[PDB]
């Protein structure tokens, strides 16, 4: 059924699974019209579909043209995301298809279940984890490819860079979620932490800087501090 802290290690077993996060599919700026009414302007979004064991990220870029002339866009966005995950599964060889898809928001359950009727053996599950995948658009190279898109496009990334050469997928997922939680709580400071040192760079083929193991321990500590600091600023503690 639902995925939580009691079965957390299941994420890193050898059954192929994907997280699907739809929080950046339908994105808008709200603004005043000349008449002083309010209107929205859509901007490009993305589906965040992630294999937590391998780091493989299937980023479907959602171009604003997909909303043209459509009504009830927030409801349409769940079904567009569900249609996109289903053509993603169908495009994969059978031995690469997931056995489970975990949606980060419960409102995605029925749209995805309906798209995946043809795959009765793929389990569609919610989670009780509060995962920070909305902050994917705070990763500069992901944000860049989304905003530059002039048409629908799928771009593949490894969100763990080369970390799995040195650490396990449990530890890599933990590092990722801490990085994304920090970027979500205070983007400016998180990005300051990550790039403060000009001598550590981001390889062309990577998303994050090339930290040594010791530097990652330092970075990870600074990210926890940032989260605790913001928690204190928030609640006055």
């Amino acid at each position: 059924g639902a995925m939580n802290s009691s079965n957390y290690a299941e994420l890193f077993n050898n059954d192929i699974k994907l997280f699907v996060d739809d929080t950046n599919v339908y994105r808008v700026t709200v603004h005043k019209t000349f008449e002083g009414n309010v209107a929205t302007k859509a901007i490009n979004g993305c589906i965040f579909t992630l294999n937590p064991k391998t780091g493989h990220l299937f980023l479907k870029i959602i171009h604003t043209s997909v909303w043209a002339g459509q009504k009830r866009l927030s409801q349409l966005a769940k079904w567009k995301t569900a249609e996109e995950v289903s053509a993603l599964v169908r495009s994969l060889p059978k031995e690469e298809q997931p056995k489970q898809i975990i949606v980060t928001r419960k409102a995605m359950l029925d749209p995805l279940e309906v798209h995946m009727l043809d795959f009765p053996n793929i389990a569609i599950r919610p989670t009780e984890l509060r995962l920070p995948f909305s902050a994917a658009m705070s990763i500069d190279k992901l944000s860049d490819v989304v905003m530059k898109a002039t048409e629908p496009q799928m771009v593949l990334f490894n969100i763990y860079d080369d970390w799995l050469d040195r650490i396990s997928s449990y530890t890599a997922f933990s590092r990722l979620t801490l990085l994304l939680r920090a970027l979500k709580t205070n983007e400016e400071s998180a990005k300051m932490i990550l790039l403060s040192d000009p001598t550590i760079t981001i390889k062309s083929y990577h998303l994050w800087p090339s930290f040594t193991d010791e530097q990652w321990i330092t970075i990870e500590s600074q990210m926890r501090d940032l989260i605790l600091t913001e928690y204190g600023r928030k609640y006055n503690v």
């Binding site: 349409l76 079904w79 569900a82 249609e83 029925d110 749209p111 279940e113 309906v114 798209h115 009727l117 043809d118």
Partner: protein
């Protein structure tokens, strides 16, 4: 007017006939029910005084044969049987009437309740839902499961209602998933009405039969079927106007007849609130919405 004689009443029992009921004491001189209206299906049903477990009963149509009830002490229940010897049957009934050992089907002349509950219910369709082809009448009880229940276990003893499942390939066309899942008109009109039921009368007949088995036997799978067939209509944007008007009448009489004290178990809060207040047909069921709001405002 037709008659269902009883050989005897050896165990104390509450006997139902359609929406009426009466108590018979152990070994009381009871020999049946007379003045049963011709032209309608009927149901005669039983709840034993010493074990209210298992309500059970028999759907029948007196135009299709001469039926009587006889207690079986081995299987421990009142059984319906057909008497093929017509002159034997007439002679038995006339004797029991002369000695006034029969209750009269107690219909008030103003009262169309039973017609209104069974308008589209036909014995031939009952016998396809309840498969036991050697008898002209059909046995139903509290515990019988439906074909759909058995999919999610004896098939001979099942209620073969039409399977309705909103998250099924039958309900959802390849390329129209959002339109079909949010607007069930395709499923209602093409798949069910044109495809399976052939017309709205057969659809309403199954809906009415499901309600009646839920109410008279507390049959849980029948209650699921009744609600699913309502929800399917209410969740369709495109429904013929005559169907909506008839559905409002059907449901009105069903809600009117429901025992007030059983509303908690026979009515699904989610389905009724969705149907009356959120669905495409939220404004199309005026009679049903008015009786629901005045009789069961707690549910809403």
């Amino acid at each position: 007017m037709n008659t269902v004689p009883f050989t005897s009443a050896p165990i104390e029992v509450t006997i139902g006939i359609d929406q009426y009921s009466f108590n018979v004491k152990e070994n009381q001189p009871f020999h049946g029910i007379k003045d049963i209206p011709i032209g309608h299906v009927h149901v005669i049903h039983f709840q034993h005084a010493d074990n209210s477990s298992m309500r059970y009963g028999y759907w029948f149509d007196c135009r299709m044969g001469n039926f009587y009830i006889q207690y079986d002490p081995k299987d421990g229940l009142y059984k319906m049987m057909e008497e093929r010897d017509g002159a034997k049957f007439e002679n038995i009934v006339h004797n029991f009437k002369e000695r006034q050992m029969m209750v009269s089907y107690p219909k008030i002349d103003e009262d169309d309740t039973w017609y209104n509950l069974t308008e589209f219910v036909q014995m031939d369709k009952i016998r396809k839902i309840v498969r036991k082809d050697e008898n002209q009448f059909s046995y139903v009880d509290s515990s019988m499961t439906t074909v759909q229940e058995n999919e999610l276990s004896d098939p001979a003893h099942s209620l073969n209602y039409t399977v309705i499942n909103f998250k099924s390939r039958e309900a959802i066309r390849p390329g129209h998933e959002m339109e079909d899942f949010l607007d069930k008109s395709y499923y209602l009109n093409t798949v069910m009405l044109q495809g399976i039921f052939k017309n709205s009368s057969n659809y309403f007949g199954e809906l009415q039969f499901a309600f009646l088995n839920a109410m008279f036997f507390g049959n849980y799978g029948s209650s699921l079927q009744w609600h699913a067939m309502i929800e399917l209509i209410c969740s369709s944007a495109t429904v013929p106007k005559h169907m909506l008007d008839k559905l409002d009448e059907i449901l009105y009489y069903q809600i009117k007849t429901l025992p007030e004290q059983y509303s908690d178990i026979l009515l699904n809060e989610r389905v009724w609130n969705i149907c009356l207040y959120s669905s495409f047909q939220k404004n199309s069921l005026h009679n049903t919405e008015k009786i629901m709001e005045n009789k069961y405002p707690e549910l809403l």
